[PDB]
Amino acid sequence: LKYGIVLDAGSSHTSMFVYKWPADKENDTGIVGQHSSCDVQGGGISSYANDPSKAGQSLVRCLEQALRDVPRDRHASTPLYLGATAGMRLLNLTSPEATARVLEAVTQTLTQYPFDFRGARILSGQDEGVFGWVTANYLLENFIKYGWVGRWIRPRKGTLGAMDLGGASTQITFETTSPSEDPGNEVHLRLYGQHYRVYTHSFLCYGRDQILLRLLASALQIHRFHPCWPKGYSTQVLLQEVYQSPCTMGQAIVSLSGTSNATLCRDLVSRLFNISSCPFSQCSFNGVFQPPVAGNFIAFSAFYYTVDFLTTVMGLPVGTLKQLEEATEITCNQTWTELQARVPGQKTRLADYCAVAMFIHQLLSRGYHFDERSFREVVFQKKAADTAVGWALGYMLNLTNLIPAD
Ligand SMILES: Cc1cccc(Nc2cc(S(=O)(=O)O)c(N)c3c2C(=O)c2ccccc2C3=O)c1
Ligand SMILES: Cc1cccc(Nc2cc(S(=O)(=O)O)c(N)c3c2C(=O)c2ccccc2C3=O)c1
């Protein structure tokens, strides 16, 4: 066996994945798998914008684990990559000098481990979307030519669309037969001798944590209470946090209480999605071109954990867009004490499930224009073939050249 390590440096958390695969048949689809993982304590690497040495340091404990997870005599030969995403893209736009110091610091730390360190890079929004789509379809074996002599399956095996909700952006990516009307959104992949025409778009500032900060700025402007927070919940909002984000530009402490108002929560949320103009033949939102969604989809990262809160803790079905919608209202309408009565556990972000759940439902119906028919093909899943679904694997597979173009 051979191994490979990806550090996924997301906006509010760094994650380490160690993959494993047989040396003797490494170019087969679905072959590479997750061997182990590690979660870094504390915030994402961009959080150390003002103390960049701490960013390299935050990675030590997990690096120590990778030394135990990867057998000694293969350290030398095992590639190590760090890919950073929207938090670092944001930090790049507000402070490119701090961004480069952060990446130098992490580079510092990584290059002294005995792995074949190949670089710390910021993924574009296209890469992020595209690599999650690769990951899903690789692990679920959709690049296989199905059938046998001469009863081949016709047409080609359909692929899975991917929706990825991270902390500072969200991505949608799917195979499409519609003409491209924007080349920024056009993707062409060559995988195992096949051509895949793919749409992808990353919405910056539309990740779960940035959505919550924008909701908090608008709740403060319009209401001076938070309709998405539960009645009997209140906190000290630090205006520094709210208004320092590049995502709220265009909006020190204030007490703020929840009111469990689903309709007004839905009003705040729906304001995130500008649908008033479209210079293309069709749009998702904010004037962005998007062809009609089609095929099966997998929705992962924070889509999964929020839906699992609804189905598990709230005990509600989310099989249809409408059950999804009713699940969000019922959650938003709970008081703080009603939430606690369901014995949900020590969830530090319990007050925000309603907002995130409402954001997801708006994003899918008002933003991406799923309806009942097309949402029937969405599954909420975080793992496939015991591997975390995200952009990490497809990234490593592309840098390591494990997928043949032919
Ligand atoms: C790396 C890893 C592996 C297994 C579980 C987790 N926990 C999580 C990992 C992610 S991740 O950023 O998509 O990885 C994530 N987005 C979440 C979690 C969570 O555990 C989680 C728990 C409760 C509410 C929301 C989340 C959540 O959004 C993280
Ligand atoms: C609702 C909401 C809003 C903003 C961020 C989160 N993220 C989280 C919320 C919880 S919670 O304590 O169960 O509330 C939580 N346990 C986690 C997360 C996470 O985001 C997370 C990310 C990566 C690894 C682990 C976690 C995680 O354990 C959840």
mmCIF file of all heavy atoms in Angstrom, residues 96-122:
data_model
loop_
_atom_site.group_PDB
_atom_site.id
_atom_site.type_symbol
_atom_site.label_atom_id
_atom_site.label_comp_id
_atom_site.label_asym_id
_atom_site.label_seq_id
_atom_site.Cartn_x
_atom_site.Cartn_y
_atom_site.Cartn_z
ATOM 1 N N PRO A 96 -3.658 40.684 1.415
ATOM 2 C CA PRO A 96 -2.747 39.718 0.771
ATOM 3 C C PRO A 96 -1.385 39.558 1.493
ATOM 4 O O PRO A 96 -0.786 38.490 1.427
ATOM 5 C CB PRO A 96 -2.595 40.252 -0.667
ATOM 6 C CG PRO A 96 -3.059 41.673 -0.623
ATOM 7 C CD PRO A 96 -3.955 41.857 0.568
ATOM 8 N N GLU A 97 -0.876 40.578 2.175
ATOM 9 C CA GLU A 97 0.387 40.354 2.935
ATOM 10 C C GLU A 97 0.219 39.381 4.131
ATOM 11 O O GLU A 97 1.045 38.486 4.325
ATOM 12 C CB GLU A 97 1.125 41.662 3.332
ATOM 13 C CG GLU A 97 1.153 42.741 2.254
ATOM 14 C CD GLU A 97 -0.265 43.142 1.768
ATOM 15 O OE1 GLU A 97 -1.259 43.110 2.562
ATOM 16 O OE2 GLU A 97 -0.408 43.475 0.567
ATOM 17 N N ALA A 98 -0.846 39.537 4.915
ATOM 18 C CA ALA A 98 -1.124 38.574 5.973
ATOM 19 C C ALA A 98 -1.383 37.180 5.382
ATOM 20 O O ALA A 98 -0.916 36.168 5.935
ATOM 21 C CB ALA A 98 -2.287 39.033 6.820
ATOM 22 N N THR A 99 -2.059 37.110 4.231
ATOM 23 C CA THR A 99 -2.293 35.804 3.614
ATOM 24 C C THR A 99 -0.989 35.072 3.306
ATOM 25 O O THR A 99 -0.855 33.880 3.649
ATOM 26 C CB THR A 99 -3.109 35.910 2.326
ATOM 27 O OG1 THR A 99 -4.307 36.669 2.589
ATOM 28 C CG2 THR A 99 -3.450 34.476 1.838
ATOM 29 N N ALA A 100 0.011 35.806 2.781
ATOM 30 C CA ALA A 100 1.245 35.208 2.394
ATOM 31 C C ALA A 100 2.088 34.814 3.627
ATOM 32 O O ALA A 100 2.743 33.774 3.590
ATOM 33 C CB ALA A 100 2.024 36.172 1.503
ATOM 34 N N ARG A 101 2.122 35.648 4.675
ATOM 35 C CA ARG A 101 2.663 35.221 5.941
ATOM 36 C C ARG A 101 2.073 33.981 6.556
ATOM 37 O O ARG A 101 2.857 33.126 7.049
ATOM 38 C CB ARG A 101 2.713 36.382 6.964
ATOM 39 C CG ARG A 101 3.704 37.471 6.562
ATOM 40 C CD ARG A 101 3.833 38.544 7.652
ATOM 41 N NE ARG A 101 2.563 39.272 7.794
ATOM 42 C CZ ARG A 101 2.362 40.555 7.466
ATOM 43 N NH1 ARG A 101 3.361 41.309 7.007
ATOM 44 N NH2 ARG A 101 1.152 41.091 7.626
ATOM 45 N N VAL A 102 0.723 33.870 6.567
ATOM 46 C CA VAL A 102 0.069 32.636 6.991
ATOM 47 C C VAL A 102 0.562 31.441 6.192
ATOM 48 O O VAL A 102 0.928 30.427 6.788
ATOM 49 C CB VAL A 102 -1.479 32.692 7.004
ATOM 50 C CG1 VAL A 102 -2.042 31.292 7.109
ATOM 51 C CG2 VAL A 102 -1.987 33.600 8.182
ATOM 52 N N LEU A 103 0.592 31.537 4.860
ATOM 53 C CA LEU A 103 1.016 30.398 4.043
ATOM 54 C C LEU A 103 2.507 30.105 4.224
ATOM 55 O O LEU A 103 2.905 28.966 4.189
ATOM 56 C CB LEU A 103 0.782 30.643 2.550
ATOM 57 C CG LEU A 103 -0.647 30.656 2.102
ATOM 58 C CD1 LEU A 103 -0.705 31.173 0.651
ATOM 59 C CD2 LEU A 103 -1.308 29.261 2.154
ATOM 60 N N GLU A 104 3.315 31.131 4.414
ATOM 61 C CA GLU A 104 4.740 30.882 4.735
ATOM 62 C C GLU A 104 4.920 30.114 6.073
ATOM 63 O O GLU A 104 5.753 29.201 6.198
ATOM 64 C CB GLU A 104 5.527 32.206 4.756
ATOM 65 C CG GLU A 104 5.765 32.759 3.351
ATOM 66 C CD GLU A 104 6.224 34.232 3.283
ATOM 67 O OE1 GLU A 104 6.788 34.767 4.269
ATOM 68 O OE2 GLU A 104 6.029 34.869 2.217
ATOM 69 N N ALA A 105 4.173 30.539 7.086
ATOM 70 C CA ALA A 105 4.234 29.893 8.387
ATOM 71 C C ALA A 105 3.851 28.416 8.258
ATOM 72 O O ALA A 105 4.601 27.557 8.752
ATOM 73 C CB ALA A 105 3.355 30.618 9.416
ATOM 74 N N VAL A 106 2.742 28.110 7.552
ATOM 75 C CA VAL A 106 2.289 26.716 7.479
ATOM 76 C C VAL A 106 3.317 25.922 6.673
ATOM 77 O O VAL A 106 3.612 24.768 6.997
ATOM 78 C CB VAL A 106 0.819 26.512 6.947
ATOM 79 C CG1 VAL A 106 -0.153 27.405 7.686
ATOM 80 C CG2 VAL A 106 0.715 26.829 5.487
ATOM 81 N N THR A 107 3.889 26.561 5.652
ATOM 82 C CA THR A 107 4.921 25.930 4.803
ATOM 83 C C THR A 107 6.124 25.588 5.669
ATOM 84 O O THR A 107 6.632 24.454 5.617
ATOM 85 C CB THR A 107 5.245 26.833 3.598
ATOM 86 O OG1 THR A 107 4.064 26.875 2.781
ATOM 87 C CG2 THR A 107 6.404 26.283 2.750
ATOM 88 N N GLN A 108 6.555 26.564 6.485
ATOM 89 C CA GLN A 108 7.582 26.358 7.468
ATOM 90 C C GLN A 108 7.471 25.052 8.236
ATOM 91 O O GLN A 108 8.446 24.302 8.329
ATOM 92 C CB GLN A 108 7.532 27.462 8.520
ATOM 93 C CG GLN A 108 8.907 27.938 8.845
ATOM 94 C CD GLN A 108 9.319 28.915 7.790
ATOM 95 O OE1 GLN A 108 8.563 29.152 6.847
ATOM 96 N NE2 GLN A 108 10.500 29.507 7.942
ATOM 97 N N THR A 109 6.296 24.845 8.829
ATOM 98 C CA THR A 109 5.995 23.719 9.683
ATOM 99 C C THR A 109 5.997 22.441 8.873
ATOM 100 O O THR A 109 6.645 21.478 9.263
ATOM 101 C CB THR A 109 4.649 23.893 10.451
ATOM 102 O OG1 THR A 109 4.677 25.126 11.184
ATOM 103 C CG2 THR A 109 4.425 22.779 11.443
ATOM 104 N N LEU A 110 5.278 22.431 7.745
ATOM 105 C CA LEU A 110 5.128 21.204 6.972
ATOM 106 C C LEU A 110 6.454 20.642 6.415
ATOM 107 O O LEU A 110 6.702 19.414 6.492
ATOM 108 C CB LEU A 110 4.022 21.401 5.860
ATOM 109 C CG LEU A 110 2.611 21.655 6.397
ATOM 110 C CD1 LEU A 110 1.537 22.100 5.333
ATOM 111 C CD2 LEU A 110 2.141 20.402 7.163
ATOM 112 N N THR A 111 7.312 21.524 5.888
ATOM 113 C CA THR A 111 8.561 21.117 5.206
ATOM 114 C C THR A 111 9.561 20.413 6.138
ATOM 115 O O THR A 111 10.525 19.771 5.669
ATOM 116 C CB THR A 111 9.384 22.295 4.592
ATOM 117 O OG1 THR A 111 9.829 23.163 5.635
ATOM 118 C CG2 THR A 111 8.661 23.091 3.566
ATOM 119 N N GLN A 112 9.391 20.576 7.451
ATOM 120 C CA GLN A 112 10.249 19.819 8.412
ATOM 121 C C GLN A 112 9.700 18.458 8.875
ATOM 122 O O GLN A 112 10.290 17.816 9.706
ATOM 123 C CB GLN A 112 10.571 20.692 9.621
ATOM 124 C CG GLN A 112 9.386 21.466 10.166
ATOM 125 C CD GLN A 112 9.653 21.992 11.559
ATOM 126 O OE1 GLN A 112 10.753 22.447 11.852
ATOM 127 N NE2 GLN A 112 8.644 21.942 12.421
ATOM 128 N N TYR A 113 8.525 18.046 8.375
ATOM 129 C CA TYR A 113 8.065 16.681 8.628
ATOM 130 C C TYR A 113 8.713 15.843 7.537
ATOM 131 O O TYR A 113 9.077 16.404 6.493
ATOM 132 C CB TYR A 113 6.521 16.597 8.707
ATOM 133 C CG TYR A 113 6.082 17.055 10.065
ATOM 134 C CD1 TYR A 113 5.975 18.417 10.352
ATOM 135 C CD2 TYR A 113 5.894 16.126 11.105
ATOM 136 C CE1 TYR A 113 5.608 18.841 11.618
ATOM 137 C CE2 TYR A 113 5.568 16.541 12.378
ATOM 138 C CZ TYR A 113 5.428 17.897 12.631
ATOM 139 O OH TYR A 113 5.073 18.338 13.893
ATOM 140 N N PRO A 114 8.902 14.538 7.779
ATOM 141 C CA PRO A 114 9.647 13.676 6.835
ATOM 142 C C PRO A 114 8.750 13.160 5.662
ATOM 143 O O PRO A 114 9.049 12.151 5.036
ATOM 144 C CB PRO A 114 10.091 12.525 7.734
ATOM 145 C CG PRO A 114 8.967 12.402 8.715
ATOM 146 C CD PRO A 114 8.433 13.781 8.963
ATOM 147 N N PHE A 115 7.655 13.836 5.396
ATOM 148 C CA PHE A 115 6.747 13.464 4.268
ATOM 149 C C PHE A 115 7.198 14.199 3.016
ATOM 150 O O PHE A 115 7.936 15.196 3.082
ATOM 151 C CB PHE A 115 5.286 13.864 4.554
ATOM 152 C CG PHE A 115 4.701 13.154 5.744
ATOM 153 C CD1 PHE A 115 4.367 13.856 6.910
ATOM 154 C CD2 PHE A 115 4.536 11.768 5.742
ATOM 155 C CE1 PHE A 115 3.888 13.200 8.041
ATOM 156 C CE2 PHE A 115 4.001 11.115 6.848
ATOM 157 C CZ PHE A 115 3.696 11.834 8.011
ATOM 158 N N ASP A 116 6.774 13.720 1.866
ATOM 159 C CA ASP A 116 7.070 14.443 0.653
ATOM 160 C C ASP A 116 6.061 15.602 0.522
ATOM 161 O O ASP A 116 4.944 15.505 -0.114
ATOM 162 C CB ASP A 116 7.140 13.533 -0.596
ATOM 163 C CG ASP A 116 7.354 14.337 -1.882
ATOM 164 O OD1 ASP A 116 7.991 15.416 -1.869
ATOM 165 O OD2 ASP A 116 6.846 13.937 -2.918
ATOM 166 N N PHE A 117 6.478 16.696 1.176
ATOM 167 C CA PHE A 117 5.725 17.936 1.207
ATOM 168 C C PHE A 117 5.678 18.566 -0.201
ATOM 169 O O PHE A 117 6.752 18.906 -0.770
ATOM 170 C CB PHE A 117 6.302 18.959 2.218
ATOM 171 C CG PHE A 117 5.537 20.274 2.187
ATOM 172 C CD1 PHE A 117 4.178 20.291 2.454
ATOM 173 C CD2 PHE A 117 6.154 21.462 1.820
ATOM 174 C CE1 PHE A 117 3.429 21.474 2.384
ATOM 175 C CE2 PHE A 117 5.416 22.649 1.755
ATOM 176 C CZ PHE A 117 4.083 22.656 2.064
ATOM 177 N N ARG A 118 4.476 18.699 -0.734
ATOM 178 C CA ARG A 118 4.306 19.274 -2.064
ATOM 179 C C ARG A 118 3.660 20.689 -2.116
ATOM 180 O O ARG A 118 3.310 21.132 -3.211
ATOM 181 C CB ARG A 118 3.443 18.339 -2.959
ATOM 182 C CG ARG A 118 3.926 16.898 -3.031
ATOM 183 C CD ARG A 118 4.992 16.701 -4.096
ATOM 184 N NE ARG A 118 4.801 15.417 -4.782
ATOM 185 C CZ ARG A 118 3.762 15.125 -5.589
ATOM 186 N NH1 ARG A 118 2.812 16.036 -5.825
ATOM 187 N NH2 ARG A 118 3.656 13.924 -6.178
ATOM 188 N N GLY A 119 3.513 21.415 -1.001
ATOM 189 C CA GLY A 119 2.979 22.750 -1.140
ATOM 190 C C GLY A 119 1.645 23.029 -0.502
ATOM 191 O O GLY A 119 0.839 22.130 -0.204
ATOM 192 N N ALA A 120 1.477 24.312 -0.180
ATOM 193 C CA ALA A 120 0.300 24.850 0.510
ATOM 194 C C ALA A 120 -0.264 25.798 -0.549
ATOM 195 O O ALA A 120 0.487 26.590 -1.115
ATOM 196 C CB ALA A 120 0.730 25.634 1.768
ATOM 197 N N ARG A 121 -1.534 25.655 -0.923
ATOM 198 C CA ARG A 121 -2.007 26.467 -2.016
ATOM 199 C C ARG A 121 -3.422 26.786 -1.624
ATOM 200 O O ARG A 121 -4.059 25.992 -0.895
ATOM 201 C CB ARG A 121 -2.096 25.672 -3.312
ATOM 202 C CG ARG A 121 -0.810 25.142 -3.891
ATOM 203 C CD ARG A 121 0.124 26.270 -4.251
ATOM 204 N NE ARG A 121 1.265 25.739 -4.979
ATOM 205 C CZ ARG A 121 2.480 25.547 -4.469
ATOM 206 N NH1 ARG A 121 2.764 25.874 -3.209
ATOM 207 N NH2 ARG A 121 3.433 25.045 -5.248
ATOM 208 N N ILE A 122 -3.932 27.865 -2.193
ATOM 209 C CA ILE A 122 -5.297 28.289 -2.008
ATOM 210 C C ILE A 122 -6.004 27.738 -3.233
ATOM 211 O O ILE A 122 -5.614 28.028 -4.332
ATOM 212 C CB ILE A 122 -5.415 29.832 -1.963
ATOM 213 C CG1 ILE A 122 -4.644 30.346 -0.721
ATOM 214 C CG2 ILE A 122 -6.880 30.329 -1.848
ATOM 215 C CD1 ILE A 122 -4.585 31.863 -0.562
#
